[PDB]
Amino acid sequence: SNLIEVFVDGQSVMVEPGTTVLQACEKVGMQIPRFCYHERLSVAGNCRMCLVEIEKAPKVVAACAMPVMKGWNILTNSEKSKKAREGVMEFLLANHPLDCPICDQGGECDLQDQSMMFGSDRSRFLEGKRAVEDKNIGPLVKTIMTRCIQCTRCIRFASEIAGVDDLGTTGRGNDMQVGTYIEKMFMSELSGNIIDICPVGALTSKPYAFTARPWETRKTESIDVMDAVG
């Protein structure tokens, strides 16, 4: 119909107009690395982890935000995109705290897994790291903001899904911090979901703290009975 033809690593695929490079790669079975992009949130484009090379184009594009065009050949495993991923992961890990043994997101961390899958295996950062003070947003979400990577997923969720405008960024540059700027509890019927959407151990479940590791647990798929939504 109105579908346009694009190529993922040379393989043809027909997509609707306005489809992003990330979604075209999804239609082929390739998952592009991501930190700030979420399917149910608005597009941000901050983390630059989704950078990918288009054939015969000197500059990489952000796959999560850039609509694909007819005739484009997306090179997901190209050298340029691999080097872009390695550099972005280096920048993300430069100031990250060495908290994995005490971080509750240890065995289920997108930062850890994408570092092992797409980053380098060593560091060349010879400086001191930044440390920020923790905020208190209630008895449900435990906050350790030194682990924050500034993806702004929580802010977008709070504004759009939960309809609460309490979360924001204060400051500028390296010391730009996610929070409320005042002592304020983030209270809503959907507040705990920001734990799941947070890719790192910056936001964790307070009642769940230090009780288990994700590899020990057995998963049972069931139904909630606390209301009539099911």
DSSP 8-state assignment for residue 174: G
Name the residue among 87, 106, 64 with its Cα closest to residue 201: 106
56 binds another protein (CB under 8 A): no
Contacts with ligand FES by CB under 6 A lie at: 34-37, 45-50, 62, 64
Is 203 among the annotated ligand-binding positions?
yes
Q: Which helix (H) or strand (E) holds 6?
A: strand 4-8
Residues in the chain: 230
- The residues, ordered by sequence, that sit 6+ positions from 141 with a Cβ below 8 Å of its Cβ are 186, 191, 192, 194, 195, 203, 204, 205, 206
Is 208 among the annotated ligand-binding positions?
no
Minimum CB separation from ligand SF4 for residue 133, in Å?
A: 14
Selected from 148, 158, 162, 195, the binder of ligand SF4 by CB under 6 A is: 148
Q: Report residue 220 as tokens.
A: 């049972």
99 binds, among another protein, ligand FES, ligand SF4, none (CB under 5 to 8 A by kind): ligand SF4
Minimum CB separation from ligand FES for residue 26, in Å?
A: 13
Is 105 among the annotated ligand-binding positions?
yes
Kindly identify the residues of this chain, within the stretch 95-124, that bind ligand SF4 according to CB under 6 A.
96, 99-100, 103, 105-106, 109, 111-112
User: Would you state the torsion angle of the CA atoms of residues 29, 33, 39, 42, taken in this order, to the nearest 10 degrees?
Assistant: -140
User: Which parts are annotated binding residues?
Assistant: 35-37, 46-48, 50, 64, 96, 100, 103, 105, 109, 148-149, 151, 154, 195, 198, 200, 203
